[PDB]
């Protein structure tokens, strides 16, 4: 029952001129990340899990970023750093062509409780 | 209504070295912007839409930047954080060929009233 | 108004230093006159209204560090910074591009006391 | 001594973020007492601990686990970046592969 | 005075991270104050002390060193960025060279 500890949530990329967010994935203790999000988060992918590990492949049931960093900020949370990268894997074995990827994430810590 | 929430202003990328922002974008709680910009906001692309729910789709009449940062100033938003991510997207089905584009984004948060 | 906002910035591109021409200043044009005084450089905005926001501001020297300085000594903090890279093609019937980087640092002040 | 920096970081079913491996850089002294025994030192080993490495790295791979340990200890996170480089594939071609390296800072001030 | 900004830095490029030099800059006087003895002047000779540079180095390779070095000296690292710059091999060539740039931002408050 550990009430701190860092929580970060991301998006990979690729009207219109908009942003556009297919995804919104979370991190970091299990635990953690029931507590803020609740019945909006989908463990399916990472499913029967102890609630003190780490995990990397939860995600949200809604899409809009700022409604995932309201959540967060009622709970304690605070953003304390982000960042953007890109990732590029060859098309096929026999080829110079690549995907181009960028990830998007956001960090949030929680201090210990008084 | 909540007064506390998080804000992002953004825009797409690229009198030619200076910079360039053809349009400013607005995320976040529908109510939170109209309370910010008012009169400056435009919701065409996102209309009749309730107060409490949550777009990416609103953009601001004028295009200078630090403008926007200053009416967050003035009704207590501070900048928490900022990124820069790149994107690109196949042209034609049967080509390599691609279009990048940029987005530069900043965000605002604002803590509950006292 | 006393508060608010300040943007410099410069754009990319003896070898491996880091390579600045030009620095660029945005922002309420009363709050980047008062910083930088004499060494703001007007000639791409000139005639503009002291309550009126530019971004087409620049400095007559070269060292970004003298200039988060300047914008030290009148009460302002850097609070973000970011750096972007844009792509346009070089003409119209090719896919051959050229690409330029931005990095800006944003400053602010808060009212006064 | 007890205060300075430290810096974790990775170079990067599918739709999620692949960290093959978190390194950590800084006084070997440091991270020692940070991570203990999760600490690998297997590239750089036999170093005086008051030296400076760049090339430990860790025995499990989440990342916020790493930042819960840092933050037990009175470290906080200062900074966070990343980075691409590109490497001709050979000697004759213009091809070439990228990596990204995401860099995350932590610090901690000196002791009462 | 003895308040002031100072940005270190890299140019990049096994698995790990490589750092070929690290570049100092700010202002003259405030970078010998911090790093000393350890600091490369050869590439920015016969300044004055209270004049401005971008083309100082550093002696090592460990940035964490240069972290710790300006945190005793009173300095907190207030942002960080990497950028990306391109350029043409040759006069009539689409081939091009990629360089990445990454910096960190220090500053220190007047004194009491």
């Keep these: 029952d550990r009430k701190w500890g860092f929580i970060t949530v991301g998006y ?3 009207d219109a001129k908009f942003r556009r967010v297919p995804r919104i994935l979370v991190c970091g203790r299990i635990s953690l990340a029931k507590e803020v999000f609740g019945e909006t988060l989908n463990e399916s992918r990472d499913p029967d899990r102890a609630p003190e590990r780490y995990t990397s ?3 949200l ?5 700022e409604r995932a960093f309201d959540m ?7 953003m304390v750093a982000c960042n953007s990268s890109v990732t590029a894997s060859f098309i096929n074995q026999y080829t110079d062509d690549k995907i181009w990827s960028s990830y998007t994430e956001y960090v949030f810590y929680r201090e210990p409780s008084r």
């Design 61 to 65: 049931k809604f899409k809009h970023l």
């Design 57 to 59: 492949r939860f995600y």
């Design 72 to 78: 967060l900020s009622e709970c304690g949370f605070h």
């Design 12 to 14: 990979r990329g690729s």
